[PDB]
């Protein structure tokens, strides 16, 4: 072991990891996006979508607010909060700032995305991208803002992190990316376009709220070999290309 | 009546049924899918989608669990159950096996589907098709497993039935099929591709939980002329081709 | 033990008590109750009887 | 059929019924007792015990009171009612007469009992048979009071019915009977006494509250071929001896 070109266990371990890296990056592989919403109580909502060809997530203002399963949520008062966020002084709420509003958002894409295809529609609380519909471009191409999440020299994911620290940061949010395709084969050409339509039906979604970033790292990111960047700027993920 | 080629009531009845069979199978017709989830209390959740060109359903682990409208659901404890299914020992639940988990799934397609186009993504409970995203093909083509539901010699639908009898059968699920098209006209060619995009918006969904398979047969399958295969292997549906 | 005494009872948690009483009525006589469920998950799925090694096995009666 | 000694279906039907009658009456058969408690709301509590050799039922004052499963029972006030029945002015109840007290009791034995063995301890509400323990015989032999419940000329059971129409009829109740044994073989002789001890462990009990006497007749008495005498003096049961 570990002394020649006849260490087949070694060579096969390296190929097994390389094949995983490369399959994900192939047109047969997944592209994945995650939206993390950070609340002031330290809990974090994750929404994930996994699909072939292209993938995205779209949420309303109300859907991004903290919801604690099986516990009190101040439901009636929070409905009035929403009315007062859709139009100033439009509601009868009993609070100035709802602690259910996200304080920050992180968007992470798998390393199989093409970063130049990333698009985001960060709307206002009534779901208008840019003040009034009449003047809205329906998305912004934000890939230049994405940081590489790296482990051991390898890009394991891409991150865009933004705070919503102001009372006026009340948002709706959609994001989208396309799987890398360095070929000249268009996956939406007529030969394959129905498979892309089927990919819309086949995409798998996951959502959950973790009590703490610790629990997210420990029980969501790490066990599934997902990439992550924490509030301390620490990168998580698994390097696979030409690696044992 | 019933003695010559001049029984016009007879001829028109036969044409009325044949026209229904054939319209469904035309490119102007519907293609439909149903997912049945069977619970240990004998109740059955149905999700149906009806659309032109192609159709599918995609559900999370949590969305497939039993929910009894207007009755207690052990909501807090069931949220902890989910945490303990996403990661072993990840939750603080007060039970070993949730009776809200489906014990079996049946997928049924209308007879207008092309069986060779059927695709299924049966994920794990965090919505990954095959253990880790890096090694996942995003679907399996399962049409070879579909049985013909037959009535009076006619295929009235297609069924795939699988049990989840083990403690480890904790799934997310998507399925997709394409309407038959024996022509060489591609419904997603440039001439018609925007109508396929509109079909995504126009698809109609239905979901409901029936207390018993009897109630499903009696009040959902039968009144709507839908195909079904029961736990006793009995076929239901209505034969229409060249039939009075 | 009675039929009812062998059913699952979770101390200090909800037990669907009214509906489970109707389940019993529908098990004592077919269609005798007004229950909101086909199969009660409170029914035992299996039973194991164990005796100490001091029993005489030929005396066992059920 | 119906014209000779070679109607074997006829002869076997008659033997099948006769064998049932006689097996019950054998030392290998059951002896059974039922206590019915009648409440002013028309509901009826039944307690049944079925055993070999001998059988009985013993209940406290409190255990005979009406209890409505899954509905309000005035529980705190009813506990105070009990305190005021155990000792005059001993409780702080908010009512003069609890409608949960039985208005009448009927005791029924199977026809396999020996009526001369019947014993009853009808105690006061603190479970003393006859005013003070020091002067109490622990039972009364009441068989002379039992009426034959008859169908088609056959005794199908034995009934003792008594009203508790007064404010002072607040009782505890036990009853016991021994299976008939016209032989000189004592079932409690040393050869078989351990089987009688085992019969104490093996006796099966049933209790339930029926909303109405109609429901008792229809869904408890009749389906099980049990004897009954209704408030109108009507007999129910099934005659089997030498009968088709």
Structure characterization notes:
Chain C: This is Polyhedrin. Chain C: Major component of the virus occlusion bodies, which are large proteinaceous structures (polyhedra), that protect the virus from the outside environment for extended periods until they are ingested by insect larvae. Chain C: It comes from Bombyx mori cytoplasmic polyhedrosis virus (BmCPV). Chain C: It is found in: Host cytoplasm. The structure is cut from a larger assembly and holds four copies of chain A. The first copy, chain A, is of the alpha+beta class and 244 residues long. The first copy, chain A, has one domain. Chain A contains five helices and eleven strands. A six-stranded antiparallel sheet of chain A has the order 6-7-4-1-2-9. In chain A, a hairpin with a 2-residue loop joins strand 6 and strand 7. The radius of gyration of chain A is 21 Å and the shape is globular. Chain A starts with 7 loop residues before the first helix and ends in an 8-residue tail after the last strand. Chains in contact: A-B, B-C, C-D. Chains A and B meet through helix 1, strand 2, helix 4 and strand 9 of A and strand 3, helix 3, strand 5, strand 8 and helix 4 of B.
